[PDB]
């Protein structure tokens, strides 16, 4: 029920902040999924998945957008997993991009 909302502008930056989360050693897999597509998935076993240069996984397991766009407007979902491969934190935020 407590997802979250954010306001941004197309063509401008924006960082998707995960509520109550800390990308520390305890965190092994941080996936940034949106709808039926991937945006940025970081796995302790290196070899992550960056949708494109338009994104950058911050040091705190955050999402750094280069230039907002239509496809960027919507609800984002983060699934944080531990080193043991278990579910840690599952969040959902609302990223509204003003055109
Ligand atoms: Ca952040």
Provide the terminal-to-terminal Cα distance of the chain, rounded to the nearest Å: 27
Structure-determination approach: NMR
Q: Return the number of other C-beta atoms located less than 10 Å from residue 90's C-beta.
A: 11
Of 98, 99, 94, nearest to 6 by C-alpha is 94
CA of 58 to the centre of ligand 1 (A): 6
CA of 61 to the centre of ligand 1 (A): 7
CA of 52 to the centre of ligand 1 (A): 19
Residue recorded with tokens 């039926």: 36
Strand 55-57, strand 63-65: pairing: antiparallel
CATH of domain 1-99: 2.60.40.10
26-60 in b/e form (b: 16+ CB < 10 A) is ebbbbbbebeeeebbbbeeeeeeeeeeeebebeee
Q: How far apart are CA 96 and CA 94, in angstroms?
A: 6
Q: How far apart are CA 5 and CA 17, in angstroms?
A: 10
Question: Rounded to the nearest 5°, which phi and psi values hold at 31?
Answer: -105, 135
């Amino acid at each position: 029920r407590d997802s979250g909302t954010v306001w941004g502008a197309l063509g401008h930056g924006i960082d998707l902040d995960i509520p109550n989360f800390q990308m520390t050693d305890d965190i092994d897999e941080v996936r940034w999924e949106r709808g039926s597509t991937l945006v940025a998935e970081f796995k302790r076993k290196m070899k992550p998945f960056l949708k494109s240069g338009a994104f950058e996984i911050l040091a705190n397991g955050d999402l750094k957008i280069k230039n907002l766009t239509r496809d960027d407007s919507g609800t984002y979902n983060v699934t944080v997993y531990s080193t043991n491969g278990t579910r840690i934190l599952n969040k959902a935020l609302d990223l509204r991009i003003l055109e």
